[PDB]
Each structure stands twice: as structure tokens, then as C-alpha cells.
Design a protein around this ligand. Structure first.
Ligand code: CDL
Ligand code: UQ9
Ligand code: PC1
Ligand code: 3PE
Ligand code: 3PE
Ligand code: 3PE
Ligand code: 3PE
Ligand code: SF4
Ligand code: SF4
Ligand code: SF4
Lengths: 182, 117, 53, 186, 315, 173, 49
């Protein structure tokens, strides 16, 4: 595994910079799109609206992320009810067969760009009920998953770390910069 | 007026431009047969929204039409207090508000203000 | 709980306190509107997973 | 004070038992609150008072925790100070794992020591119960302190022995400190 | 000269429009911080510097997000309803009194009554146009709100009007030069805030949205573009109605600075209440308006008809 | 000038109103026209006081009939009529063309606006609506207002008796 | 020094569980009486205006 740089070696490395695309763009047009691409990502990154799914006993720890101790809202994360206004879905709990068509539909109704987070073992791979006769073995069978948060339930910080991974994943989208090459 | 109409149009144009920007600035993806389906908590809907929706405050609904048209007759009061005969203005105004209260309390006591049960 | 002398339970039935509570929701909230039914659902004090074994 | 509609026996407390007085001194008191929003007034004082408290939020990730040495997190295969792996493929952990998240295949090593050629944990099936670390007779498998290992792919959540061994080296210092401060209870 | 005069009137409206549009963005942040502090939370603190650019950081998302074309909706109605919701919210500001003239508006008090009533259709049409069960319930939950507050609203305005002598809002300044009508009209101030909440559909009167009774009310079927304007139109209503409380009960010194310190405070009160009270029950409101408020308001017309008459004899 | 264009629109919206079938299509047409008629009336008067009142009165009636439309005629259909859109748009532009080339001193209504009044008219320097609404509350015409009051209250007794609330809600069975 | 989590020598103090109501400043007569006075003075100053 790639280990972190030592202090002395890191003592020379240049400051990272904010944009993951750097300021090394050859042309003006490319550079403007790169900077303009950051503006989109800065927007979507800032305000990520979950859907308030809350299926099973991960759902309780999905409340304590909104509790004052950790305060999801500090990061611009605001819970919402309608899937139209919701941007992210946190599938937290055991997605049984009876639910499975309902999650698919609710996910479909969510407008793009939509990212899915899988909370806990139940939604990751079927978890403790993996072999049950009425459990979908992981929600990735039904909807694409963008971040997997392990745990049972994941700690509140663990989910917070998951959300920040989604911000970083959002931060590095190349929606515009890849249109130029296309 | 004519000033207000012009700004009324100018605002409407401006607000209209806002979505006309949103409609283009919006990310565009192929629409799915399920993406545009209605939202009813993730399960297909049994009943169209265009079925007859029963009503229970119908009686109040009609009383609302009335009570407004007496708001047309109280509003002019102030404007004509300096200019009117005080007895006629005083007497008539009171027997205007007593009539309203008596009407209200009469129905309240008869239980019409309560919803259909 | 039933045991058959083995290392594993033979059968484990689990009473959910909310099971009875939700069965009665058919009548308790009858002739009430959504704001009341939403209130009743909370006061029934039903944590699902109990009801769904 | 008003009286109780139902007399109360011993060892029981009633919530709505006191009746309502009908003395003008009290009816006016109820009337005044019902008439000037008196009940809601104190409700507004309380909420405003909370503006003047330090909020309990933590500036994660710069500040975080607190936890305890017993915390159950990501797994890791420890090894002896010599460097030799502790696990001897006894397979108690596999047999006790409620989720059947562990798979082990063992073989007589070249030097002849009982050891594993395979040790896989399916982190999307584990429940972080901690029975594996209680059953291991040589403390080979432990649930390390780490709880920040979310991935972007399902496959990366299936740990094989090399991944588990790497954790047991990255996290070795902290695990050895938790075991020392906690083994006596266990 | 005269040709120049109306040019300035355009500038004022545009200046007032952009300033109100900007403020409702920052009001939404203020709502989240304050509501985040009444709750022991911290509120938005990371984005940009100390959270100040948060509302702009959200306006990006709601516009780079796709429109939703509901399958069973009359699309043209569904698509236009957001426009008129925002238009009616901004348009009602042209009557806000300025001593540096913007619009004369004799009978300005009435112009309030007309415009606020219109705000119900936009909710009403949006809910019905969406053609979803919840959306329709939201719309008809909003209409029933009007049936309640509408009549009592006019009467309570009439009481304030008797004090000043005319429907021109400017006169509120002259009569509130020594003191504030809050003292004379304390129960009405308390009642007026209550009706003001119904106007803007806020907790404890949040029925059009109806969060946790209806999934999202009449907004349940809106998305990036339409939903944003519905949102901004909502908070523009709060800002104006908060100001209208400041011109009636709190001095109406529009040219003084403190008037704007007051204006934000009443805006804080609207957030403050949202973090205190649970929502009323859909029927209890309509009973409240007709059983108590309407009877209450009529009672003081007599009190102020007598008081004005008595005062007229002396003066 | 806009008076003629108001004439064109009120005519245009009336032509289509004859052709509406869906109740809500009728309502939208009617609501738009209530705006124009309200606007137009205040042009030929000393004040817009009555336009405010008329607008406020009708909006009360607008909401109520939606409540009943949404309960009785909920399930009905629209049909865009290309004949209608062309016809209205055809005449509308045609009418708008005339208003530009019209002797619009001749088309203006002779009713005396407030400014149209002389400067000597001493009664025109009072409050905007003082005199006009005055004798609504003075002897002898005040009794007419009183007569309305019973008429309105007696009406309030008629609806409850016609309605017979206690025998149920209203549904389009 | 105890070798196990145990109550201290002499035990913990008593834990408050009962309900304590907040301070009451206003009664029916004082509230109704004050309002009339406040309104009356309000009319008094209003007249001068
Ligand atoms: C209201 C919103 C503002 C909220 C307050 C905070 C803003 C300031 C801030 O955060 O400073 C951070 C920053 C500290 O970070 P840093 O370590 O120095 O390096 C910044 C990045 O690491 C190095 O930057 P980077 O280039 O690697 O990545 C950022 C990327 C993109 O910039 C962004 O991330 C923002 C969103 C995209 C750009 C938006 C414009 C879109 C297209 C532009 C192309 C045309 O490139 C840039 O645009 C940065 C160039 C600076 C000029 C901006 C152009 O502060 C500064 O260094 C400068 C002070 C801020 C400017 C104040 C100017 C005041 C002028 C008065 C008017
Ligand atoms: C878990 O338990 C819980 C629940 O149960 C589920 C809850 O429901 C809830 C519910 C919470 C609430 C209801 C909180 C209130 C929040 C909401 C109702 C919605 C959430 C959204 C917000 C708070 C954000 C507020 C703002 C908006 C929605 C958008 C409004 C529109 C805005 C700001 C745009 C204003 C217009 C302007 C012109 C401003 C100035 C300029 C801009 C914006 C331009 C931006 C950028 C550009 C033009 C790019 C230019 C670039 C270049 C030229 C290079 C909680 C708290 C909870 O804890
Ligand atoms: C009775 C009382 C009614 C009170 C409510 C009046 C307004 C309700 C209109 C509902 C929409 C009518 C309609 O469907 O026409 C579609 C029309 C088109 O008619 P259409 O016939 O072509 O629609 C059918 C389309 N096909 C044929 C494909 C099926 O589209 C519009 O332009 C309507 C725009 C409505 C704008 C929103 C109104 C909000 C007003 C707020 C208050 C005023 C400010
Ligand atoms: C309210 C605040 C709103 C803030 C708005 C910020 C807007 C930034 C604009 C960036 C584009 C956002 C919309 C978008 O995502 O378009 C992407 C599109 C590329 O998509 P595409 O290549 O087709 O992907 C494959 C699909 N099958 O892109 C394209 O196809 C063409 C891209 C050309 C560059 C366009 C740049 C537009 C700049 C607009 C600034 C607006 C400022 C006013 C708001
Ligand atoms: C001094 C005036 C004395 C009036 C006495 C009224 C005492 C009780 C009032 C009351 O509300 O009791 C219930 C009674 C039943 O009426 P009901 O058909 O159920 O309608 C809903 C009523 N809340 O409600 C009623 O019937 C009447 C309620 C309104 C009475 C107002 C009379 C005010 C006269 C001044
Ligand atoms: C105009 C351009 C203003 C922004 C210039 C930013 C220059 C500073 C260096 C680059 C940068 O940091 O941009 C991102 C900036 C701060 O970084 P941020 O993403 O918010 O991370 C949390 C920081 N506590 O976050 C920002 O403040 C960027 C805000 C830009 C978009 C604001 C929305 C209105 C549209 C402006 C065009
Ligand atoms: C295509 C047709 C284009 C024609 C414009 C149609 C849109 C109408 C928008 C203007 C409505 C406002 C208005 O005209 O008010 C006129 C009148 C003002 O009278 P006054 O008290 O003297 O105040 C004058 C201050 N300068 O006050 C009134 O007459 C009452 C106005 C009530 C306005 C309600 C808001 C309607 C919003 C537009 C809905 C479409
Ligand atoms: S993963 Fe664990 S905590 Fe989450 S729902 Fe399943 S059993 Fe409960
Ligand atoms: S913690 Fe429990 S479920 Fe997870 S691997 Fe260990 S024994 Fe199995
Ligand atoms: S219980 Fe310990 S020694 Fe036995 S197989 Fe598992 S990890 Fe290895």
C-alpha cells in the first residue's frame, strides 16, 4: 500500500492546490472549462441532500449524524423527503424483496446527477441476513452504488467519513472537461 | 398604474428568463418511463389524482364568499368619517358589526361552523 | 423458545409488542384524518423489525 | 391544588388525575394564559435561552472521538514480536462467526507449521460482533481501532489475508496498546 | 424633468428586486444558522468561509439539476406555476412605503390584500397541475388555509387603518413618531403574527408543504428549476410580511438604519417560532380563524369605532 | 395607447371564453379577464378603489369554484384548437395594428378622469374617495346598506337550510 | 484503591428525579390588570400624537 510521504520528503512537496485538475491547462479554452468545471463541483459538493430513507437499524445512526454531536448540516447536508429534490440516497438497512421494487422506483425518480451511499452490512452485501429467503443480497444488485460504508451499524463518524468521500468524489467529476475532448 | 404595469411586465420577463436559463443550464439525460412516473412513496398508484375529492368544509366555503362581500362595506368606513353625519355613521356602523357578530354566533351555536361529521 | 437437546434451537418464536398494537390501528384511527393518524402511529410506539421477524 | 378524580394506591403514579378547579382565582389564571399566549411564552423563553449555550458540535475530522479501548472496528491479523503470524488456522473464528463471513484454508507449511494459505473476511457480511476476537486462542484476529475504511467499490470490501496482514502492521502499535489495557477484563 | 422621473422608478424597482432576491438567499442561510443554534447544533459552517457563501453554493445545484417532466401532469401549467409564484412575491414589494417616492399607492393597504390572495393560486395550480395524490392534497390544504385567514386578515388591517385615517402606508410614520402601535395593539400584534404565519405557510401553520403529513406537499413533484423559484417565492413572502410588521407596529422609519435592524429581528422571530411550536391540525386552524379570530377582530372595530368617535369629539 | 390594447385583449379573451369546455380552462380565461376589466374600469374613474374591491370580491369566488370544480368536474379534458389559436392570434395582431393607426383622441372615453376635471372644481381636492363613497352611510341612502345587511344575513340562513350539512359530505357519486 | 467499579465510600449523592416547575411571575389579575393600564396609557399618548 502506498504509504504517506515522510516529513522531510513532504517538506519539499508543493502546496497541493484546491482544484484536482491543477492549473496546467495548455489553452485558454481548456483552462476556462477546468475552472468552470470546479464551479459546478463546488456547487454540487457543497449541498448534498439525502432522501431520508431510513429502512432499518442503520437508520437510527443515520439520525445521529444529524444530531448536534456531528451535525451533518455543517457540511451543507440537509435531509429532504421528496425524491425529486433529493440528490443523494443513503440506503441504510436490509433491502428485502418486498422493498426492492420500491427502492428502484424511488431511485429512478431521483433526478441526475444522483449518487447512492450504502450504509452498513445489510445494504452492502446482505449483511447478517445474507442467506435469508427474502433478502436482496446487497443493494448494488438493484441500484448502482457510489460509496460503501461498512459497519453494523456504521459509527456516526464512520458515516461522516463516508459522506466526505462522496464530496471528494463529487469534487473530481470531469463533466465539462470531458465534453471538450468529446 | 401605467408605471406599475410596465414594471409588472418587466419583472415577469425577468423571472421568465430565470427558468429559461435553468432549462438550458440543467443537466440533460434521457427520460425514462419510470423517471417521469408520479411520486407516491415508491409504490405504483392505485387512483388517479383526478378522482372526485370529497369535501367537508363546503358550508364554510360558501360562507367565505359572503363574509368577504361585507368586507367591501366596512372598508369605506374610515374614508368617510370626517365627511359624514356622526349619528348616521355611528349608528349604521355599529348595527353593521353587531349584525355580523350575531350572524356568526348564531351559526356557531347552531354548529354549522363545525365540519361535516 | 423450543430446544430439542441439540446445540441449536429448534424454533424461536418472538413476540413483538407492536404486533398487537398495529393490528388495532384498523379501528383506533378510523374516522380520523392524516394528521391524527400520523400522531397515532407515533404513540403506538412501533419499532419495525419487531413486527417483521 | 385541586383534588384527584381517582384515589391512588401505593407504588403508582398518575399522569392525568388532578381535576380542574372552578374558583375564579384559578379560572382567570387559566383564562389569562389561554388569552395572552401565556403557555407559549415560556416555551419561547426556553428556546431563545439555548442560543446562549456553547453548541455541542465537534469539528470533525480535526476533532473527533471519543471512543474506548473496547471499540470494535476493522479487522487485522496480528503477529508475534518475532514477526511470525499468530494465526495457526485453528478455525474457531470461522465456526463462531455468526455471519459466516470468514473463510479459511490451511496447509502444512514448508517448515511444517500449521498455517493458513487462505484467510478471507467478507466485510459486507460481517456484523462486527467481535466473537472472532474472543474465540481466537492466540489473539491472532482482532477488530482494530479503525472505523474509516469506506470504499468506492464492493470488491474492495472483501479482505484477503494480505490485506488483513497489512492492517495488522499499519495498526500494530495501537492494537497492542488496546489489548494490554483491556485483556484483564476479557 | 418628467421624462426622467419614470426612469428612476424603473431603477428603484430593479434595485429593490435584486436586493430582495439577494436577501432571500441570505435569509435562507440565516434560517439555517439560527434554527441550527436554537437546536444545540452549529449550523452551516464549512462551505467557503464560515458558511456565508452557503446559499449561493446551493443555487448552483438547483440549476445544474435536470427538470422533471411528470408523466401525468399538464406540462404547461406545471411549468408556469413557479413563475407566477415568484412574480407575485416580488411584485407585492412595489407598495412598500418609501419617503423617497417609488410609487404613490394611495389605497396601498388594499393592494396588499389583493396580492397576498393571489399567492394561493400558484400553490393551488402547481399542486393540481402536478397530478399526484400528495400534490393535490397539498393544494387543497393550501386553499382551506385561505378560507380561514383571508377574512380575518382584512378586518385586522381595518383596525390599524382606523388609527391612521387612510389606506396610504406613509401615514403610519407620522402617527408612530412618539411611540409604537405595538403598545396600543398588543393582542393584535400577537394575533397579526399568527395570521402572518398562515400567509407564508409556516410552522405551526405549515399545511401546503405539510412535511411529515404529506411527503413534501404541493412541491413533491417539482425539481431543479421549478422547485427553486417556489422556494425563493416562499422566503420573499416572509421578508415582506416581516417588513409589513415593522411599518405597522415598530415605528416605520424607513429611512432610518434601525428600521432594518428591526426588520431582520422580525425575520428572526419567524425562524424562532418555527423552532418552537408543533404544527396545528388541519381543521383546528379553520376553527381558530372563524371561532376566535374573526369574533376577536370584530370586537375591536367597535372599540376603535368608539375610540375614534370619542377622539373625534375632542379633536 | 394601452386603453385600445385593453379593448383588444378583453375582446380576444372573450372570443376564446365562448369556446372553452373544460371548467378550469373557463376559470383561467375568466381570471385573466377579471384582471383586465378591473384595470380598464379604473381608467375611466377618479380612483381605482372599485377595481381593488371588484378584484378582491371575485378572487373569493375564484377559489371557491375551484374547490367545487376539483370535487365535481375533476376528470375532464383539454383540446388545443389550432383553429382557435390562429383565429385569436390573427385578430389580436389585427386589432393591435389598428390601435397604432387609430385617432386615439377619438377613441378615448368621455368619462372624466380625476385629471380630466377642471382646476376650479373645489370638490376634487379632497381625499381620493371621500365624497363618492360618502352617502353610502348618510341619510337616507344608508338604509339601503342596512337592508343589504339583513339580506346578507338572511342569505346566510338560506345556505345552511338549503345545504343541510348534517346529512353528509359532498362527493361526485 | 478499589479493584472493581464500585460505589464510592459512602455512596453517590441522591439523584434529582422530581419535576421542578419554572419561576411564575404573572397571575390572571396582574396580567389582565396590566393590559388595561398599558392600553389606557397607549390611548393617552396616541391622543397627543
Ligand atoms: C462569496 C464566495 C467567496 C467565499 C469566501 C472565500 C473565498 C476566498 C478563499 O476561499 O480564498 C482561499 C485562498 C487560500 O487558499 P490558497 O492556499 O492560497 O490556494 C488556493 C488554492 O489552493 C489554489 O487554487 P487552484 O487554482 O489550485 O484551484 C481553484 C481553481 C478554481 O477556483 C475555485 O475553486 C472556485 C470555483 C471555480 C472558479 C469560479 C470561477 C469560474 C471560472 C473562472 C475562469 C474564468 O482555480 C482558481 O480559480 C483559483 C485562482 C484564483 C483566482 C480565481 C479565478 O485565499 C487566497 O489565496 C486568495 C484570497 C481570496 C481572494 C480574495 C480577493 C478579494 C477581492 C475583492 C473582490
Ligand atoms: C433528520 O431529521 C430531520 C428531518 O426529517 C426528515 C427534516 O425534514 C429536516 C428539515 C429541514 C428543513 C425544512 C430546513 C429548511 C430548508 C429547506 C426547506 C430546503 C433546503 C435548501 C436550503 C436551506 C438552501 C436555500 C436556498 C435555496 C433552496 C435556493 C434559493 C435561490 C437562490 C439562493 C438563488 C438566489 C439568486 C441570486 C441571483 C443570488 C446571487 C447569484 C447567484 C446565486 C449566482 C450563482 C452563480 C453563477 C451565476 C455562476 C456565474 C459564474 C461565472 C460568471 C464564471 C431537519 C433539519 C431534520 O433534522
Ligand atoms: C373555477 C375556478 C378556477 C380558479 C383557477 C384558475 C386557473 C386554473 C388553470 C389550470 C390550468 C388550465 C390548463 O390546463 O390549460 C393548459 C394550457 C394549454 O391548454 P391545452 O388545451 O393545450 O392543454 C392540453 C394539452 N394537450 C392537448 C396536449 C393535452 O396551458 C397554459 O398555458 C395554462 C397556463 C397556466 C399558468 C399557471 C396559472 C397560475 C395563476 C396564478 C394566479 C394569477 C397570477
Ligand atoms: C443560479 C446559478 C446557476 C449557476 C450555473 C453555473 C453553470 C455552469 C455551466 C456548466 C454546464 C452545466 C450544465 C451541464 O452539465 O452541461 C454539460 C454539457 C456536457 O454534457 P455532455 O457532453 O452532453 O454529456 C454527455 C451526455 N450524454 O455541456 C455542454 O454540452 C456544453 C458546454 C459548453 C460550455 C457552457 C458554459 C456555460 C457557462 C454558463 C454560465 C452561466 C452563468 C449564469 C448562471
Ligand atoms: C357571556 C356569554 C355566555 C355564552 C355561553 C356559552 C358557553 C359555552 C360556549 C361553548 O362553546 O360551549 C359549547 C357550545 C356548543 O356548540 P357547538 O354546536 O358544539 O359548536 C362548537 C362550540 N365550540 O358552543 C355554542 O353553542 C356557542 C359558542 C359561541 C357562543 C358565543 C356567545 C357570545 C355572546 C357574547
Ligand atoms: C468569483 C470567484 C470567487 C471564488 C474565488 C476563489 C479563489 C480562492 C481559491 C480557490 C478556492 O478556494 O475556491 C473555492 C472556495 C474555497 O474553498 P471551498 O471549496 O469552499 O472549501 C472549503 C473552504 N473552507 O470556495 C469559494 O468561495 C468559491 C465560490 C465561487 C462561487 C460562488 C458562487 C457565485 C458565483 C461566483 C462567480
Ligand atoms: C398581457 C396583458 C398585459 C397587461 C398587464 C396585465 C398584468 C397586470 C399587472 C398590473 C397589476 C397592478 C396594477 O395595474 O394595479 C393598478 C391599480 C393601481 O392603482 P393605484 O392605487 O392608484 O396605485 C398606483 C401606483 N402607481 O391597482 C389595481 O388596479 C389592482 C391591481 C391588482 C393587481 C393584482 C396582481 C396581478 C398580477 C398579474 C397577474 C397576471
Ligand atoms: S447493517 Fe447492522 S445496523 Fe445496519 S440495518 Fe443491518 S443489522 Fe442493523
Ligand atoms: S466480528 Fe463477528 S461477524 Fe464479524 S468476522 Fe468477527 S465473528 Fe464474524
Ligand atoms: S481463531 Fe485465531 S488462530 Fe484460529 S483460525 Fe481464527 S485467527 Fe487463526
Amino acid at each position: 500500500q502506498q504509504t504517506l510521504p515522510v516529513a522531510e520528503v513532504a517538506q519539499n512537496l508543493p502546496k497541493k492546490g484546491y482544484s484536482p485538475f491543477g492549473t496546467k491547462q495548455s489553452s485558454v479554452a481548456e483552462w476556462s472549462l477546468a475552472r468552470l468545471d470546479d464551479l459546478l463541483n463546488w456547487g454540487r459538493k457543497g449541498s448534498i441532500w439525502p432522501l431520508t430513507f431510513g429502512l432499518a437499524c442503520c437508520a437510527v445512526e443515520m439520525m445521529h449524524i444529524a444530531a448536534p454531536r456531528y451535525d451533518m448540516d455543517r457540511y451543507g447536508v440537509v435531509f429532504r423527503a421528496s425524491p425529486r429534490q433529493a440528490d443523494v440516497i443513503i440506503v441504510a438497512g436490509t433491502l428485502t424483496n418486498k422493498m426492492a421494487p420500491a427502492l428502484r422506483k424511488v431511485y429512478d425518480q431521483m433526478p441526475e446527477p444522483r449518487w447512492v451511499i450504502s450504509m452498513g452490512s445489510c445494504a452492502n452485501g446482505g449483511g447478517y441476513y445474507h442467506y435469508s429467503y427474502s433478502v436482496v443480497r446487497g443493494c448494488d444488485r438493484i441500484i448502482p452504488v457510489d460509496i460503501y460504508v461498512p459497519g453494523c451499524p456504521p459509527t456516526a463518524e464512520a458515516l461522516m467519513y463516508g459522506v466526505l468521500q462522496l464530496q471528494k468524489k463529487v469534487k473530481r467529476m470531469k463533466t465539462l472537461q470531458m465534453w471538450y475532448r468529446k | 398604474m401605467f408605471s406599475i404595469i410596465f414594471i409588472a411586465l418587466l419583472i415577469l420577463l425577468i423571472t421568465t428568463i430565470v427558468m429559461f436559463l435553468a432549462s438550458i443550464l440543467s443537466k440533460k439525460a434521457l427520460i425514462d418511463r419510470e423517471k417521469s412516473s408520479p411520486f407516491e412513496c415508491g409504490f405504483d398508484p392505485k387512483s388517479s389524482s383526478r378522482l372526485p375529492f370529497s369535501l367537508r368544509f363546503f358550508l364554510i366555503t360558501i360562507i367565505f364568499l359572503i363574509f368577504d362581500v361585507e368586507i367591501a362595506l366596512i372598508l369605506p368606513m374610515i374614508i368617510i368619517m370626517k365627511y359624514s353625519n356622526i349619528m348616521i355613521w355611528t349608528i349604521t356602523s355599529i348595527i353593521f358589526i353587531l349584525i355580523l357578530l350575531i350572524g356568526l354566533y348564531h351559526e356557531w351555536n347552531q354548529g354549522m361552523l363545525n365540519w361535516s361529521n | 423458545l423450543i430446544s430439542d437437546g441439540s446445540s441449536r434451537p429448534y424454533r424461536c418464536k418472538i413476540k413483538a409488542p407492536g404486533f398487537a398494537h398495529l393490528a388495532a390501528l384498523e379501528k383506533i384511527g378510523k374516522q380520523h384524518m392524516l394528521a391524527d393518524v400520523v400522531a397515532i402511529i407515533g404513540t403506538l410506539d412501533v419499532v419495525f423489525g419487531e413486527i417483521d421477524r | 391544588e385541586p383534588k384527584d378524580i381517582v384515589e391512588v394506591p401505593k407504588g403508582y403514579v398518575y399522569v392525568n388525575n388532578k381535576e380542574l378547579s372552578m374558583e375564579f382565582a384559578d379560572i382567570t389564571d387559566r383564562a389569562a394564559s389561554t388569552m395572552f399566549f401565556g403557555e407559549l411564552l415560556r416555551g419561547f423563553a426556553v428556546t431563545l435561552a439555548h442560543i446562549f449555550k456553547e453548541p455541542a458540535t465537534i469539528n470533525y475530522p480535526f476533532e473527533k472521538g471519543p471512543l474506548s479501548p473496547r471499540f470494535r472496528g476493522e479487522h487485522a491479523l496480528r503477529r508475534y514480536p518475532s514477526g511470525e503470524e499468530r494465526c495457526i488456522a485453528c478455525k474457531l473464528c470461522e465456526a463462531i462467526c455468526p455471519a459466516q463471513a470468514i473463510t479459511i484454508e490451511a496447509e502444512e507449511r514448508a517448515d511444517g507449521s500449521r498455517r493458513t494459505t487462505r484467510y478471507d473476511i467478507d466485510m459486507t457480511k460481517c456484523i462486527y460482533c467481535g466473537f472472532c476476537q474472543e474465540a481466537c486462542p492466540v489473539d491472532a484476529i482482532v477488530e482494530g481501532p479503525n472505523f474509516e475504511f469506506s470504499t468506492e467499490t464492493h470488491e474492495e470490501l472483501l479482505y484477503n489475508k494480505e490485506k488483513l496482514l497489512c492492517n495488522g502492521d499499519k495498526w500494530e502499535s495501537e492494537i497492542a496498546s488496546n489489548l494490554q489495557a483491556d485483556h484483564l477484563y476479557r | 424633468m418628467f421624462y426622467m422621473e419614470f426612469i428612476l422608478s424603473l431603477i428603484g424597482s430593479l434595485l429593490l428586486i435584486i436586493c430582495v432576491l439577494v436577501s432571500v438567499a441570505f435569509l435562507t442561510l440565516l434560517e439555517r444558522k439560527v434554527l441550527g443554534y436554537i437546536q444545540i447544533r452549529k449550523g452551516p459552517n464549512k462551505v467557503g468561509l464560515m458558511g456565508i457563501p452557503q446559499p449561493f453554493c446551493d443555487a448552483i445545484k438547483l440549476f445544474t439539476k435536470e427538470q422533471t417532466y411528470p408523466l401525468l401532469s399538464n406540462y404547461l401549467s406545471y411549468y408556469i406555476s413557479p413563475i407566477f409564484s415568484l412574480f407575485l412575491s416580488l411584485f407585492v414589494w412595489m407598495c412598500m412605503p418609501f419617503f423617497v417616492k417609488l410609487y404613490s399607492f394611495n389605497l396601498g393597504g388594499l393592494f396588499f390584500l389583493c396580492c397576498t390572495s393571489l399567492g394561493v393560486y400558484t400553490v393551488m395550480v402547481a399542486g393540481w397541475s402536478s397530478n399526484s395524490n400528495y400534490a393535490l392534497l397539498g393544494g387543497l390544504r393550501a386553499v382551506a388555509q385561505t378560507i380561514s385567514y383571508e377574512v380575518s386578515l382584512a378586518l385586522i388591517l381595518l383596525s390599524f387603518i382606523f388609527l391612521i385615517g387612510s389606506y396610504n402606508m406613509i401615514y403610519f410614520f407620522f402617527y408612530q413618531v412618539y411611540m409604537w402601535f405595538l403598545i396600543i395593539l398588543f393582542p393584535m400584534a400577537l394575533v397579526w403574527v399568527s395570521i402572518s404565519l398562515a400567509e407564508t405557510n409556516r410552522t405551526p401553520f405549515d399545511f401546503a408543504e405539510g412535511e411529515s403529513e404529506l411527503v413534501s406537499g404541493f412541491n413533491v413533484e417539482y425539481s431543479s428549476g421549478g422547485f427553486a423559484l417556489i422556494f425563493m417565492a416562499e422566503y420573499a413572502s416572509i421578508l415582506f410580511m416581516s417588513m409589513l410588521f415593522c411599518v405597522i407596529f415598530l415605528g416605520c422609519d424607513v429611512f432610518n438604519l434601525l428600521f432594518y435592524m428591526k426588520l431582520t429581528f422580525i425575520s428572526f422571530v419567524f425562524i424562532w417560532v418555527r423552532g418552537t411550536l408543533p404544527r396545528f391540525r388541519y381543521d383546528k386552524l379553520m376553527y381558530l380563524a372563524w371561532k376566535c379570530f374573526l369574533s376577536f377582530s370584530l370586537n375591536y372595530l367597535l372599540f376603535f369605532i368608539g375610540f375614534k368617535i370619542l377622539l373625534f369629539s375632542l379633536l | 395607447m394601452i386603453q385600445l390594447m385593453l379593448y383588444s385583449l378583453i375582446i380576444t379573451t372573450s372570443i376564446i371564453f365562448l369556446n372553452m369546455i373544460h371548467p378550469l380552462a373557463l376559470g383561467l380565461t375568466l381570471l385573466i379577464q377579471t384582471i383586465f376589466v378591473c384595470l380598464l374600469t379604473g381608467l375611466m374613474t377618479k380612483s381605482f378603489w372599485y377595481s381593488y374591491i371588484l378584484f378582491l370580491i371575485f378572487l373569493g369566488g375564484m377559489l371557491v369554484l375551484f374547490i367545487y370544480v376539483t370535487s365535481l368536474a375533476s376528470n375532464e379534458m383539454f383540446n388545443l384548437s389550432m383553429k382557435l389559436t390562429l383565429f385569436s392570434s390573427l385578430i389580436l395582431i389585427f386589432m393591435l395594428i389598428l390601435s397604432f393607426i387609430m385617432d386615439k383622441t377619438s377613441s378615448s372615453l368621455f368619462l372624466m378622469n380625476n385629471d380630466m376635471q377642471s382646476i376650479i372644481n373645489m370638490n376634487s381636492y379632497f381625499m381620493e374617495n371621500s365624497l363618492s363613497l360618502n352617502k353610502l352611510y348618510n341619510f337616507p341612502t344608508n338604509f339601503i346598506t342596512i337592508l343589504l345587511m339583513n339580506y346578507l344575513l338572511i342569505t346566510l340562513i338560506v345556505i345552511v337550510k338549503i345545504t343541510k350539512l348534517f346529512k353528509g359530505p359532498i362527493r361526485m357519486m | 484503591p478499589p479493584k472493581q467499579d464500585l460505589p464510592p465510600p459512602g455512596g453517590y449523592k441522591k439523584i434529582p428525579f422530581a419535576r421542578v416547575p419554572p419561576k411564575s411571575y404573572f397571575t390572571g389579575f396582574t396580567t389582565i390588570g396590566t393590559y388595561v393600564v398599558v392600553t389606557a396609557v397607549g390611548l393617552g399618548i396616541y391622543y397627543l400624537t
